[model samples]
Target: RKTSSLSILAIAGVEPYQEKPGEEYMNEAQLAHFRRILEAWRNQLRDEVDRTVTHMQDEAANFPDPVDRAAQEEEFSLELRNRDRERKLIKKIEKTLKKVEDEDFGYCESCGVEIGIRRLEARPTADLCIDCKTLAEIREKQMAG
Candidate 1:
């Protein structure tokens, strides 16, 4: 069954990807589509990073009392941890966008196969097909057990 639409994230300047009959998989148009999604996601993450910096700058204060200072530090520590994870994701998104530009996107890393439209649309950074991912998960469970 062909899924013509996807549950897209909040992206700027996005239109539904329309596939033509008998079009090749992962062609330039499809690559462009994923690129746009990655670009939008990266920009959004960058905007969030900027917002976090602004918030810390505005919120940072030197409280004289030790208890108040400790409380503020703890809160800021949590915010920094979140921003750090976001920063790593932003870097990963940048790398994925480059892959799209080079026409090397949307293939499973574990096995050289098409990762499918719906899966790619949902997860642009996916490096493994569902089969491979499921096997990987199964392996993890086996190891745990």
Candidate 2:
């Protein structure tokens, strides 16, 4: 039986940030925590993309039956859509990583309020606090509806 201290984040495979009482926000430790989370997230997405590429390469085959070809094409098309979304997500993660380097993370872009460590841990790339996000969502719904 192999036991590891990182077993706490074993399910998520990410270490949770635990802020000490009266600790400074966005300090080196906190920044590193978020950095690890973002890096893991980005790496996981990248690995999926690579797997998809390999799977498509392995499964790609010329077929005399047009129906079989169509099915394969459809499957690839869906994977393309998913990968496209993931590409943008990776970009967002990179932008956030830069913010962490720039010493400007852990604050809400919308309100300039501390976004809180736990909130950021739950969603590392979050740029707004709960209130701001809820308000934005409401406005978006209003505009759409």
Candidate 3:
């Protein structure tokens, strides 16, 4: 429709952070801040995905020339592939939102460790710390090989 457009979304839920070993418990203000950050992050992702859907649907078309049609199809195919990945990411965002609701957002599921605010800010859907995530990646590589 328009050359470029952006949409804003709101996030409403808040959750408390849990106490962690070897770390001081998060104060209410800190927890509230993190909740706002996570909600904002999730909302941004959701909005981006929604925009992508609209962009693809509106732009998708077939060309009359065979080569042009083939190239356009290939381009749209790649776009659809990327959108499929984002579709899965949206599911993860929803799951993380639920975890936030359950007060289980910032803890590692594998090791029961605090994922930390910085890491969570960098990756809002993270469920493992760097060390555990690295190990899991290595294990996955081994399995794939």
Candidate 4:
């Protein structure tokens, strides 16, 4: 139930994959393109993780007032939670990058369909096609209730 930050593409500083006529899917060029993106995104998250660590180290202070200490603890907890999410996302990106290296990227895990270039550009870690993803969302919602 966590969401990644918006503008991963912008942060990665990559352009959309332009389709050349008669180009094959998940070819070396496409794989290289996505590899660059995933690496950039992962590096950005890693930087943020380091930033959070240093911030916590510098800001962590012993307060005599109970209220002040509670507030500081609350802030740390929130930051830790966010870092946990980002950590998981970085792991996923690594996994996806491995898939790219193994020549198994860009296909839907659920249905074995091409996930499409535009879709991958939007979500490089997506392992499910649109249909499968939608179905999964519906099932998850039903199960949640």
Candidate 5:
């Protein structure tokens, strides 16, 4: 049996960032911290895409039975939808990675406030502060209602 030290806190295989007093926001260390997360996230998605390709290649078949054919098609359709969603998500991650490189990461796009490290840790691709994001969610709910 394997003794596992890995925990859910190790998101994208990264431990949480330790903030020191007087450390500047989005400093080199924090930037690298987020970069590591974004890169790992992107690669995990890429691996899933590759795995889907191979799985489809290996499992694809021309079934004579209509029911089996429909089942396989449905399964593939679901997988493709998941792949498409993640593909778009990868673009967002890449964009965030660019922001990290440009030294423009970690500020809210809507209000120019610092997007707190805890929020960013939970969502590295987040571009808005908690308040802005909460307001946006309220607006979305209102629109839906």
Candidate 6:
């Protein structure tokens, strides 16, 4: 079922559709559509993270045996780590939402180009083109190593 938000997000723009050989530009409507989609996805993720936190806190138990207690604590520690990552993701999502508000949501930050609807749909948080993102990832890996 398509929600109003989805419909709002799918509207195409007035510009002639420019097919960039292997790429496509999202019109204003499409950009709006994707913005909403990204916002919705981020909201959902945040909600899930919140739920996980609540569940973890409420369901945490301490077994009397040292081994069992340690195991349970370890499990909670892992869950908390996962939640922490999601918390960071929520911050990114909020930033993306701000981009949408600022009319800077759909363009590549590094190249100053349209980042394409398909790519945005696949990764709504993307701020770089595949090439730029790949290079950045390589640099990050190198730095870590």
lDDT of each: 0.81, 0.80, 0.66, 0.88, 0.82, 0.69
Residue pairs with backbone atoms closer than 3 Å in model 5 (clashes): none
Residues 1-145 of candidate 3: C-alpha lDDT, one tens digit per residue:
1212112112333333344666553445555556575566566667767887787776654334766877767777887788788778767877887776777677888898888765665566788988898999999999999
Which of the two candidates, 1 or 5, achieves a greater TM-score against the reference? 5
Candidate 3 scores a C-alpha RMSD against the true structure in Å of 6.8
Mind sharing the TM-score for model 5? 0.81
* Steric clashes per prediction: 0, 0, 0, 0, 0, 4
Instruction: List the candidate numbers ranked by lDDT, top first.
Output: 4, 5, 1, 2, 6, 3
User: TM-score of predicted model 1?
Assistant: 0.79
Model 6, span 41-103: residue lDDT tens: 667668878898887877564344666777777778988999899788778878887887787
lDDT of 2 by residue, 1-145 (tens): 1435332234246656666899889889889878887888888888888888787777675443766777888888888889888888889999999999998998988898999777776678998988998999999999999
Off by over 4 Å in 5: 1-11, 62-67, 140-145
Q: What would the TM-scores of all predictions be?
A: 0.79, 0.80, 0.69, 0.85, 0.81, 0.72
Candidates, ranked, TM-score? 4, 5, 2, 1, 6, 3
- Which stretches in model 2 have alpha-carbon errors above 4 Å? 1-13, 62-70
**Which lDDT value does model 2 have at 48?**
81
Runs of candidate 6 exceeding 4 Å displacement:
1-24, 61-67
Cα lDDT of candidate 5 equals 0.82
